[PDB]
Amino acid sequence: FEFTLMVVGESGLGKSTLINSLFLTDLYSPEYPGPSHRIKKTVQVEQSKVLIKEGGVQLLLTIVDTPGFGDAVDNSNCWQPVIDYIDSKFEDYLNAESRVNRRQMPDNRVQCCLYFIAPSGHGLKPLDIEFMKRLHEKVNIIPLIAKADTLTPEECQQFKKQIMKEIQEHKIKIYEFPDEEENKLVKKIKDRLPLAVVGSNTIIEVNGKRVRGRQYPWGVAEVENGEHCDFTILRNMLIRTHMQDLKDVTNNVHYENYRSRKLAA
């Protein structure tokens, strides 16, 4: 069982911290640092495959990051390297379907893209709009309000209402979730979009119980507390539950639309 996860966003939005929080491993370490430590003269797309035991079941996780995205004074066409990576993996699969001896099929298509949104408290920046409008028909985009502890409950609430107002306005198609217990998490997710997440790999004692979170002098933001952020909703909807449905939408929707467009010429 394999899975290809892509993270896109500015440096300093906690992307390296959230990835290591979702999978409880050191996927980004002094050996293979986060994308903010791998920035070059131009925007690059880099991948790293790693083996993960998720509760006694193995997982072949491939993280694809985009070091340098949004970090320059001129971010013109900084989304294009991401398009080239995703479409080249579609071409890699199409060339595998057209083989005479197509016994084994290498599937390296990007099945899910976490796009981090800077917590302005206002709305979406032109970079955010332009990225999601150029990749929503090529990958399953899951918008995240990065560093949710930046916003008070009231600010974060209307921040979400504004982001969805502009998603709907610009005709943006983010990944949506399709058993009535499976339809139980769908209703509790639609009312919380976009998910506001907090990341941390540090554990601290909060009234006896040891919780994973970020310690400020005035309080502790707890990562696995549904009343502080939406990290639990993200982890449950990504690994445990709808991972296969993300894989299926990639093959049946985005790859089929890439193929139907490629062969028409």
Binding site: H122, K125, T152, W218, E227
Partner: protein, 280 residues
């Protein structure tokens, strides 16, 4: 009374207008009524100003806040510091034409920017090229005070590391930000301004418009489910350091450097333009 012009520069959504309202404990920010706070981002860098008279017992400060909507908010922010440098230079031009004082006024109208707050987003990494490109261009023509925006988004360990990192970058790039060490009057000024250049700056600031009661006392702060950060509390952030610096102590020192250094350099340059001096 006297005039004072302060400019805030930074990406949209860094707490700029909220901080200005905290500095002056008044609704002096440009955004003041309902949906006017929820403002659209312009496609280019626009310069906007608003004026208020703040009275503090005979000290009628004529305050003008200048903000720069659209800075660092576009996909392509190339040369977005030039519209801000153009505004600063053209305020020198206004003063250059009015200090002759044909109107014979006790006080010449002053619209030059005396203090420019540049807000750095707390990324936990090194400075952004936009941050460097602005300061190395503008620190030569205005007084730039670098602040860390939204300081409540960092822990003590993160905040101490980010301050050292920004401070080392500014010293390495030859960015002479206010207070410039060249303009220390004596040893008493060097002593207080070394502590500010080397410890208190960049001011890790937090702004807030709302008040809460924390263990009996009314305090400004931001209310989270896990606790309330007190804005005027030096154990939580460094707003009070920024306030005692700009408002209580170095208010006039800011206007003096503006006049005797930046404006004078511009005035001496303008005398040699357009063919030079007129014959007399």
């Amino acid at each position: 009374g006297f005039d004072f012009n302060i400019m805030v520069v930074g990406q949209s959504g860094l707490g700029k207008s909220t901080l200005v309202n905290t500095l002056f404990k008044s609704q002096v920010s440009r955004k003041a009524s309902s949906w006017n706070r929820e403002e659209k981002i312009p496609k280019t860098v626009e310069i906007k100003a608003i004026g208020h008279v703040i009275e503090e017992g005979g000290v009628k400060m004529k305050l003008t806040v200048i903000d720069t909507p659209g800075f660092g908010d576009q996909i392509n922010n190339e040369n977005c510091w030039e519209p801000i440098e153009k505004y600063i230079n053209e305020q020198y031009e206004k003063f250059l034409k009015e200090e002759v004082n044909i109107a014979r006024k006790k006080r010449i109208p002053d619209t030059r920017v005396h203090c420019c707050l540049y807000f750095i987003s707390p990324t936990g990494h090194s400075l952004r090229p936009l941050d460097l490109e602005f300061m190395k261009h503008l620190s030569k023509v205005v007084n730039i005070i670098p602040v860390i925006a939204k300081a409540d988004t960092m822990t003590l360990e993160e905040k101490s590391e980010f301050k050292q990192r920004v401070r080392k970058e500014l010293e390495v790039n030859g960015i002479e930000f206010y207070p410039q060490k060249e303009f220390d009057e004596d040893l008493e000024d060097k002593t207080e301004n070394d502590k500010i250049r080397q410890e208190s700056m960049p001011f890790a600031v937090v702004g807030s418009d709302k008040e809460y009661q924390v263990n009996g006392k009314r305090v400004l702060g931001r209310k989270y489910p896990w606790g309330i950060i007190e804005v005027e509390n030096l154990n939580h952030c460094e707003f009070a350091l920024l306030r005692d610096f700009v408002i209580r102590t170095h208010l006039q020192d800011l206007k003096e450097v503006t006049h005797n250094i930046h404006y004078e350099t511009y005035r001496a340059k303008r005398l040699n333009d357009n063919g030079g001096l007129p014959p007399v």
